[PDB]
């Protein structure tokens, strides 16, 4: 099959499918090649026997776009006899598109493009670093692509503030490697990024500036801070509206009231300055959170408002509850069957926290009114933890990009890119070859890359939307044997539950075992195939 | 000379509960009780008066009843403002006397106190002694550790905390430990830390400095 | 605006006498009834004794007739409690009332407005006066510590009454020379530093000292 | 599913009291609600069912109230033995669902503690750690300072307390400090001391010994 | 004589299954309802699923639905209660309960008698059987000093039960170690030492641990 | 005047008034002679030359006898022209009444007599000292008369405990030095002497053994702790009744119940074992107290009880207070002219305290049941403090005997013995010569020894019942120079309180002053006269 997306630190050929034998007819192809990293660029350079149907390029023709997928920039619309000119990247990546409707065809090479621009990029071990814009505090260079990791022991928290921040020309945030781990956000303005506090082991910023008149600029500072957690420990805390480690960035709503004075900022729970208010009262309307992180989710607690400006009592009777690991992908929390709705205030003032019956692993949150009194206003906190409070429970790498693509296995794919099969990361889902395959003969495999101690794993589905139901785990040291983990009770391998939806992930925990390779096999799952996405969990010995 | 007696002396709600406080009188004193509130650090105001007559600015939310030498105060929906010591009167003998007051606290959910630490300012550091203090704001519940390390060392009782009462606003606490040491000693050391454990802490959160 | 302020309280030798004064404002104190309340530190209000100035009827808890007596100067609009024989269980704080009884029965005996009291205490330890250090720096905390007094109390203010969002003042702490201390802190959004002056308004009447200390933040 | 929530929390009496303590069913119960009595480290027992109809055994001072969605339990003398939390039940829906509970405190006068001293015993000195432990008996109230001193030196958070329930009989507390040091450190010293203070005593009450 | 006595608590590993039975002694099983109810520690009561053993008619609290099965065996005339898929907030003291509502309605779901409970902990940690010292000496104070154990409880008797008058056992705290450790004190007369005999009764189930420690005081 | 009481430590004669001169008629005469301590004893001898009228000693004779006062054996009887017989003490006590109804009468020479007996008695300074019957743990001698003392710093009790004791003979517990300052108890059985906490500076025993078959004797041990009260300290705490520290001894009653079921040792507080109930329910029944030590009540509260066979409850409804400096000369306490009913208890179990609303300084206590509940029946605890719980104030020595006889001077007398003046410990009181004087013209004085700084006193009547009313009080460091305590409002000297009465004490502060020497003036006093028992409170500099 043609098509495809390459890795251009080998340089490669790319030609129509049977070159230089005459192309098909009535099919078209679409290549995407890229650098490693924003630094570097592409040049491809054609081949000058070329040979496409003319017209004016009405039928046959090849398209290249500046960047990545169709509605980039339009580098050259080409046919006929005449090559193109060699073509360079403005960026990291090229987006080919051939299109058929007779003709030897075309070949190309392409490789990388090297600018000379610097490779500014640090990495951080040290417990009280610091880090900023190259030149500060004087203006920032063009043209600079670079990026900032600060990498983490085991049981170390990155916390990340920001002194001054001021800038086409953006900063930002990710939750492990570049463009590999979720984005957490795009800075750019005069606003000042809010604290991170992150338990991965990694966070990374990216540096973007363009040719024209440079600003300010930033500068930040980390510190890495020790963690343990105890064992009567129960994943009840407060995760920071009231408290403000939530920063105002976080909270956002539908739409806000008109007079300004009822905004998302102002539903930290016992805040004394009113509440938030939608422009118009509506069961469509919500306020949410970006927690930023996968954390887990174990209690709501709401309340109503009181107007300073005139001392009427507001709040929500009852609320759902939409929860989703990347703010696009959203599932309304369930009780049985239906929609769950929660019984929430019956005044003012008083605090009424509901419990989830099921704990919850999200990243966004949003609360979505149901019933009210005169109208809705809210005033919020939200409990839990995350993850990693458990002993030996770190993300082993999948979500972040730790784990490389060269270290994911599968046993049989449709198509391939292994960053698909990244909790969260991934836009898609590892699909295997037979989207309706036979139980225990399809699996999906981890190389941790040494032996650790591992003590669950983190399944999602894929979005085509479809999720496991039920799997097997096996493990391994070497990569040839293998064990099953057991049920003491059936003493057949134990099934495990998978998910209930396309992109709610859920965390099984299984007793301590030893293993560099892991795999999951699924048994039962929905309609559409078996769609999955997966991360592992455990630490080292 | 009448005898009055509050119960329960002490106890704790939630915003919103309706709560009933009790006075016994130990000889009949028919409609004549007063009820007065008592606010930290401030004088009692009258809420009450003739048993179960409202005096002027006082909310709703406020009644009383009661004759002969049962009487009884109702707050119908609490509210935070309401922490604060009740205090029954009997306005019918020669000789005014109170009862023995009953504590209102107020249980809300849990909080996670924010902490600050404070290096002695050069101005004492002329005076011979040295003063680190450690703050945690705006926490609930009252229960929370705050050890003193110098030199990564466990220190003793040579330091000494204070709370306050809860806020009338959010109805959290806050506390201060204070450290004091010798010129000799705070100038020989570098490494002091404040570490603060706490319920609605996951992990123990520590604050420190170096000169 | 009826007022009620007292004053005279303070440090005393067991044995020896202490006056104290209720002045009233607002109103004429002649044709009401004025009380004495007291409050040991922590323990209950306790009934000590009224006047009516009009009639000049007095009369007195059992725990002090004997010791205690009380006045009023109608021309001065003042009332007073002359104190003596005072022991360690007169420590305390002591609150005029105002009672409005006339033509309302229902009145009778209930103290309508109080003042804020004054604190008495029944030591014979020796006056000292408080040493204030600043206690230095999207949020800040910035506070005052006020080190080594007797007796009780201090009061603290910040930018004079102006600042009281976020103000949180300790309970004094005994030390263990003898002397009491505490700290007052405020929390405000840390943009405003270097903008923003913050002095703290200390205050400790017993030993006559009123200290205004400005709090503040390698070439 | 139908909620319970019970007011106050908690409380403190004194014996004697008259004391009532309040449950609201988010949604109408009829007289289907039970009332249990929970005792420190045992499980709890009926008391009332049905609102107000007193189980067997039960002593008469206990009663019920209420219909609808406000149910009250009254016990019209408390006595020590009721030290305990009280939860009250619904009894309507399919599925139980209890409240959150209310803790009963008993408040007493002020009675002084007893203290004893502990030396480790030989059988431990082998294992290579040495634990003494300091024995405040039989007091009232809970508050008491229990400072360690090892050759008349104030000692840090490397001892640990604990404290008794109030006793079912007198209403005092009860109260261990364990300290806890190496071979190495309790071999080398020789003066051992706990201090005590607490209201109840006039003065610092200190026990001690040597090796 | 109606006896209800769990058993099947103790240390499980988090996503592990734990199997607890609550015998029934003194009447028949078959004929009553037998619920669930657990307390995580130092909180309150919730109910958690019950059984109806003629009917087998079963229900269950929606935080445990799907993990949790109740079952009933009358022959053995016991009452079981699977757990799966465990984690912390399934720690807990869980206790059955009898329910006798044949012919009376004001008794349904009353629940009449329970069982005294048994301690399920959720944790990674390690099973430490505990080592058990004495506390050596009118009136005088001896103890048990139980030392370094995990999990929860450990259950103390002094004489076998005989001396129950003066004991004080306290709650276990906590160490850095990540152990348990408790004390157990009872104050007798001091006359009758060297007369009377004191061991205390030590026991730890999770560990299969049951000591008995004898208590006693140059030439 | 003839008659008197005279120390033998110098050598004196004693002779019929008028010798060698016919004595009077009609009169009758009496003297005491005495050794300074038991250890030693009197011998007199007569002069020969010796004459009382005849007849068989029916009207004229003189008589000795062993000891003290008139009930003492008799030595001897004599009249005629022969003078009696050497005749020596059996203690170190002899009584001589000469009694008349003409002849020249008698003369006799009187001295310390000495047997060889030991001085076993020893002073104590040490922290943790122990003292025991001589030759112990073996029988101890015959005919012993000793005396332990032990002496304390300023802020340091003295606790003294028993590890055996078994003993005519006896043994006699002094608060201060023997037969001067008061008696706490005189032992002498197989129940040991209940451990003593004292804070008077001094505590005292007295040996004393018989020629006939010794017993096992008496160990015992004592320690010397400090103790600091605070400024911030309240006299509000429990004395011992449910701590234990008031042991069973202490505790009687007027009688108790024929079945051995409610005995006083029952009344504590919170007693698990009934209560305490007499032999028969009427309001002339008492409990007693006996708390050793002059100490303030602050405050009583009281139970009922229920019965252990029956569970029936009973309860005192009301009561009184009487309360005793020496358990002999009482007072019930009033609330303006008339008794004090304190209202008590109303049902078997809670529990009732009555503060007192004027302190009381006391030693004995006793609770009288007026009005109760099918029967009388308490527990019962005590508040207070002691006097030296104040910062300085101890007992500088009147009451314990530390300030000897020779360091007190009065105006003038009506006699004289000095350790008449002492507070508690003296059995009369100080009466001036004219009993009816003038005011502020009559004084008493105590010489301290030593410039101390004083902080008040502490006034008493006298037993012939009167108390000093009012008074003022001057000091001086030399002797001729005098300063009165001056009111700052009258700018006169202060006119303090004296007593309502002639055994319950009272406690008078004033600024600290410094002074060797103070002197007590009465202004008004009670219709019998000017009666006076006194001490001084203060410290050293
Ligand atoms: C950080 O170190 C280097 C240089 O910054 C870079 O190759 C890479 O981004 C990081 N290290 C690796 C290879 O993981
Ligand atoms: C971190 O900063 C510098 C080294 O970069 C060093 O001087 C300072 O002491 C360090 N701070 C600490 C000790 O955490
Ligand atoms: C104690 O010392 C000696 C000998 O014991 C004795 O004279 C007297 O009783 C005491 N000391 C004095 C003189 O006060
Ligand atoms: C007291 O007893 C002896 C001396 O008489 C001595 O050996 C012991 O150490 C002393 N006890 C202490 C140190 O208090």
């Known amino acids: 099959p043609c098509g495809g997306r390459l890795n251009s630190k080998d340089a490669g050929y790319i030609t129509s499918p049977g070159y230089p034998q005459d192309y098909p007819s009535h099919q078209n192809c679409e290549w995407i090649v890229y650098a490693p990293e924003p630094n570097q660029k592409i040049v491809l350079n054609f081949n000058p026997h070329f040979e496409i149907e003319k017209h004016d390029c009405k039928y046959d023709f090849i398209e290249i776009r500046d960047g990545d997928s169709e509605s980039a920039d339009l580098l050259g619309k080409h046919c006929g006899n005449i090559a193109p000119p060699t073509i360079i990247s403005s960026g990291s990546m090229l987006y080919i598109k051939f299109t058929s409707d007779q003709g030897a065809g075309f070949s190309l090479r392409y490789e990388i493009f090297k600018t000379g621009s610097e490779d500014c990029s640090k990495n951080f071990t040290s417990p009280n670093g610091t880090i900023e814009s190259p030149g500060f505090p004087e203006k920032y260079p063009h043209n600079l692509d670079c990026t900032f990791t600060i990498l983490a022991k085991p049981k170390m928290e990155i916390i990340l503030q920001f002194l001054i921040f001021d800038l086409y020309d953006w900063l930002d945030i990710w939750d492990g490697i570049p463009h590999v781990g979720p984005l957490i956000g795009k800075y750019c303005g005069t606003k000042t990024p809010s604290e991170l506090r992150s338990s991965t082991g990694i966070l990374s910023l990216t540096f973007h500036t363009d040719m024209a008149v440079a600003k300010d600029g930033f500068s930040a500072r980390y510190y890495l801070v020790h963690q343990e957690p105890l064992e009567n420990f129960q994943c009840n805390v407060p995760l920071g509206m009231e408290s403000g480690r939530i920063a105002n960035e976080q909270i956002s709503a539908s739409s806000t009231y008109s007079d300004g004075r009822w905004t998302p900022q102002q539903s930290r729970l016992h805040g004394d300055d009113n509440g938030w208010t939608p422009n118009l009262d509506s069961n469509k309307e919500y306020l949410q959170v970006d927690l930023r992180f996968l954390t887990m989710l174990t209690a709501i607690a709401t309340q109503g408002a009181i107007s300073r400006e005139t001392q009427n009592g507001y709040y929500v009777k009852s609320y759902k509850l939409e929860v989703s690991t990347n703010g696009e992908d959203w599932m309304v929390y369930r009780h049985g069957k239906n929609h769950k709705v929660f019984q929430a205030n019956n005044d003012a003032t008083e605090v009424v926290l509901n419990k989830l019956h099921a704990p919850l692993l999200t990243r966004f949150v949003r609360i979505r009114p149901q019933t009210w009194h005169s109208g809705i206003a809210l005033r919020l906190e939200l409990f839990g933890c995350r993850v990693t409070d458990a002993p030996c429970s770190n993300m082993l790498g999948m979500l972040s990009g730790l784990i490389a693509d060269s270290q994911i296995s599968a046993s049989s794919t449709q198509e391939w890119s292994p960053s698909a099969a990244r909790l969260v990361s991934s836009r898609s889902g590892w699909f295997p070859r037979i989207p309706q395959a036979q139980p225990g003969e399809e699996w999906l495999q981890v190389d941790l890359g040494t032996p650790k101690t591992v003590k669950g794993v983190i399944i999602q589905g894929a979005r085509a939307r479809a999720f496991v139901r039920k799997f097997k785990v096996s493990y391994s040291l070497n990569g040839k044997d293998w064990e099953y983990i057991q049920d003491p009770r059936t003493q057949q391998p134990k099934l495990f539950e998978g998910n209930m939806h396309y992109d709610t992930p859920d965390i099984r925990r299984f007793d301590p075992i030893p293993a560099q390779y892991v795999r999951v096999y699924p048994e039962r799952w929905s309609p559409a195939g078996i769609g999955m996405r997966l991360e592992v969990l455990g630490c080292d010995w | 000379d009448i005898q009055m007696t509050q119960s329960p002396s002490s106890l704790s709600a939630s915003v919103g509960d309706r709560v009933t406080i009790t006075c016994r009188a130990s000889?009949?004193?028919?409609?004549?009780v007063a009820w007065y509130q008592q606010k930290p650090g401030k004088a009692p105001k009258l809420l009450i008066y003739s048993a179960s007559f409202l005096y002027s600015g006082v909310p709703s939310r406020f009644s009383g009843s009661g004759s002969g030498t049962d009487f009884t105060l109702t707050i119908s929906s609490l509210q935070p403002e309401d922490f604060a010591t009740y205090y029954c009167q009997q306005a019918w003998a020669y000789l005014p006397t109170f009862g023995q007051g009953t504590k209102v606290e107020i249980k809300r959910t849990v909080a996670a106190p924010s902490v600050f630490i404070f290096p002695p300012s050069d101005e004492q550091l002329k005076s011979g002694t040295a003063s680190v203090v450690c703050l945690l704001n705006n926490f609930y519940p009252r229960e929370a550790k705050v050890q003193w390390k110098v030199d990564n060392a466990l220190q003793s009782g040579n330091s000494q905390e204070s709370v306050t009462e809860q806020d009338s606003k959010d109805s959290t606490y806050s506390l201060s430990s204070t450290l004091t040491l010798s010129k000799a000693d705070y100038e020989k050391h570098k490494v002091y830390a404040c570490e603060v454990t706490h319920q609605g802490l996951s992990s123990p959160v520590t604050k420190s400095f170096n000169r | 605006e009826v007022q009620l302020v007292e004053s005279g309280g303070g440090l005393v030798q067991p044995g020896g006498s202490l006056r104290l004064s209720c002045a009233a404002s607002?109103?004429?104190?002649?044709?009401?009834?004025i009380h004495w309340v007291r409050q040991a530190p922590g323990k209950g209000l306790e009934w000590v004794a009224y006047?009516?100035?009009?009639?000049?009827?007095?009369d007195y808890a059992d725990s002090v007739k004997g010791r205690f007596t009380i006045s009023a100067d109608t021309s001065k609009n003042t009332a007073y409690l002359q104190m003596n024989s005072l022991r360690a269980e007169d420590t305390a704080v002591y609150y005029c009332?105002?009672?409005?009884?006339?033509?309302?029965?229902?009145?009778?005996?209930?103290?309508?407005?109080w003042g804020q009291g004054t604190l008495v205490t029944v030591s014979s330890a020796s006056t000292k006066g408080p040493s204030v250090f600043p206690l230095a720096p999207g949020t800040a905390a910035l506070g005052c510590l006020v080190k080594d007094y007797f007796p009780e109390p201090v009061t603290v203010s910040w930018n004079s009454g102006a600042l009281t969002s976020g103000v949180h003042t300790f309970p004094a702490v005994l030390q263990s020379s003898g002397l009491y201390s505490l700290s007052s802190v405020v929390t405000v959004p840390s943009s405003s530093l270097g903008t923003q002056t913050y002095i703290c308004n200390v205050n400790h009447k017993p030993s006559n000292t009123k200290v205004d200390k400005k709090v503040e933040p390698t070439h | 599913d139908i909620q319970m929530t019970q007011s106050p929390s908690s409380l403190s009496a004194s014996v004697g009291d008259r004391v009532t303590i309040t449950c609201?069913?988010?949604?109408?119960?009829?007289?289907?609600?039970?009332?249990y009595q929970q005792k420190p480290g045992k499980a709890p027992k009926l008391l009332i069912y049905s609102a107000s109809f007193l189980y067997s055994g039960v002593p008469s001072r206990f009663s019920g109230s209420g219909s609808g969605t406000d149910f009250t339990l009254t016990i019209s003398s408390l006595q020590p033995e009721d030290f305990a939390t009280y939860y009250c039940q619904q009894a309507w829906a399919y599925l139980p669902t209890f409240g959150q509970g209310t803790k009963v405190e008993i408040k007493r006068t002020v009675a002084a503690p007893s203290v004893f001293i502990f030396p480790p015993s030989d059988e431990q000195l082998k294992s290579g750690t040495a634990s003494v432990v300091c024995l405040l008996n039989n007091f009232y109230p809970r508050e008491a300072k229990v400072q360690w001193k090892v050759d008349n030196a104030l000692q840090s958070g490397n001892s640990q307390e604990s404290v008794t329930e109030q006793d079912s009989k007198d209403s005092t507390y009860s109260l261990s400090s364990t300290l806890t040091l190496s071979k190495a450190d309790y071999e080398k010293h020789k003066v051992y001391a706990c201090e005590v203070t607490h209201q109840g005593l006039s003065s610092p009450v200190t026990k001690s010994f040597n090796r | 004589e109606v006896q209800l006595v769990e058993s099947g608590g103790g240390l499980v590993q988090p996503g592990g299954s734990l199997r607890l039975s609550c015998?029934?002694?003194?009447?028949?099983?078959?004929?009553?309802?037998?619920?669930?109810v657990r307390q995580a520690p130092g909180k309150g009561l919730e109910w958690?699923?019950?059984?109806?053993?003629?009917?087998?008619?079963?229900?269950?609290?929606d935080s445990v639905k799907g993990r949790f099965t109740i079952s009933a065996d009358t022959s053995k005339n016991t009452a079981y209660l699977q757990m799966n898929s465990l984690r912390a907030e399934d720690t807990a003291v869980?206790?059955?309960?009898?329910?006798?509502?044949?012919?009376?309605?004001?008794?349904?779901?009353?629940?009449?008698?329970?069982?005294?409970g048994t301690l399920v902990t959720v944790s990674s940690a390690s099973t430490k059987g505990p080592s058990v010292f004495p506390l050596a000496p009118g009136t005088a104070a001896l103890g048990c000093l139980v030392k370094d154990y995990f999990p929860e409880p450990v259950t103390v008797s002094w004489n076998s039960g005989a001396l129950t008058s003066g004991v004080h056992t306290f709650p276990a705290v906590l160490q850095s170690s990540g152990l348990y450790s408790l004390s157990s004190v009872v104050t007798v007369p001091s006359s009758s030492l060297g007369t009377q005999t004191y061991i205390c009764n030590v026991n730890h189930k999770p560990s299969n641990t049951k000591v008995d420690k004898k208590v006693e005081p140059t030439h | 005047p003839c008659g008197g009481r005279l120390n033998s430590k110098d050598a004196g004669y004693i002779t019929s008034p008028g010798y060698p001169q016919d004595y009077p008629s009609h009169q009758n005469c009496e003297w005491i002679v005495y050794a300074p301590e038991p250890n030693q004893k009197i011998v007199l001898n007569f002069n020969p030359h010796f004459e009382i009228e005849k007849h068989d000693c029916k009207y004229d004779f003189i008589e000795i006898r062993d000891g003290d006062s008139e009930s003492a054996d008799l030595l001897g009887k004599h009249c005629g022209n022969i003078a009696p017989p050497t005749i020596i003490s059996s203690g170190s006590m002899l009584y001589i009444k000469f009694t008349s109804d003409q002849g020249a009468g008698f003369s006799l020479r009187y001295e310390i007599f000495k047997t060889g007996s030991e001085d076993c008695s020893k002073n104590f300074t040490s922290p943790n000292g122990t003292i025991e019957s001589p030759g112990f743990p073996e029988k101890y001698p015959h005919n012993l008369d000793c005396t332990f003392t032990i002496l304390a710093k300023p802020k340091m009790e003295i606790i003294l405990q028993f590890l055996i004791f078994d003993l005519y003979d006896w043994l006699d517990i002094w608060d201060g030095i023997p037969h001067v300052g008061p008696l706490i108890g005189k032992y002498c059985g197989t129940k040991t002497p209940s451990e003593l906490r004292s804070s008077t500076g001094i505590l005292s025993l007295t040996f004393h053994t018989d020629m006939a078959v010794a017993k096992d004797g008496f160990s015992a041990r004592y320690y010397l702790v400090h103790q600091e009260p605070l400024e911030n300290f309240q006299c509000n705490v429990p004395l011992g009744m449910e701590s234990g520290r008031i042991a069973n001894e202490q505790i009687s009653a007027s009688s108790t119940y024929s079945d051995g079921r409610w005995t006083p040792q029952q009344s504590r507080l919170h007693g698990d074992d009934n209560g305490w109930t007499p032999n028969l329910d009427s309001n002339k029944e008492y409990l007693q107290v006996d708390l050793r030590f002059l100490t303030m009540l602050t405050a009583i509260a009281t139970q009922g009880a229920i019965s252990r066979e029956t569970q029936n409850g009973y309860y005192v409804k009301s009561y009184k207070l009487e309360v005793s400096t020496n358990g002999e000369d009482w007072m019930v306490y009033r609330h303006g002219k008339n008794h004090k009913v304190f209202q008590a208890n109303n049902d078997a179990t809670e529990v009732v305290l009555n503060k007192l609303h004027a302190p009381l300084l006391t030693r004995f206590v006793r609770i009288r049941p007026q009005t109760w509940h099918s029967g009388i029946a308490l527990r019962l605890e005590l508040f207070g403090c002691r006097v030296t719980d104040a910062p300085c104030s101890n007992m500088l020595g009147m009451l314990s005997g530390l300030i000897a006889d020779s360091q007190i001077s009065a105006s003038s007398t009506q006699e004289w013995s000095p350790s008449a003046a002492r507070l508690v410990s003296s059995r009369s009181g100080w009466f001036p010569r004219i009993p009816q004087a003038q005011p502020g013209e009559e004084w008493l004085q105590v010489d301290l020894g030593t410039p101390k700084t004083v902080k008040g006193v502490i006034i008493q009547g006298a037993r012939a019942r009167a108390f000093v009313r009012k008074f003022k009080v001057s000091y001086s460091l030399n002797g001729k120079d005098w300063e009165y305590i001056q009111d700052p409002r009258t700018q006169q000297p202060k006119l303090f309180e004296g007593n309502m009465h002639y055994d319950t004490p009272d406690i008078r502060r004033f600024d600290p002053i410094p002074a060797q020497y103070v002197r007590v003036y009465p202004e008004r006093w009670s219709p019998a006269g000017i009666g006076m028992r006194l001490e001084v409170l203060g410290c050293d500099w």
């Open positions: 000889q009949d004193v028919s409609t004549a």
């Open positions: 006047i009516y100035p009009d009639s000049g009827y007095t």
């Open positions: 607002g109103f004429t104190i002649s044709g009401y009834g």
């Open positions: 009332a105002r009672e409005d009884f006339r033509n309302r029965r229902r009145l009778w005996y209930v103290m309508d407005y």
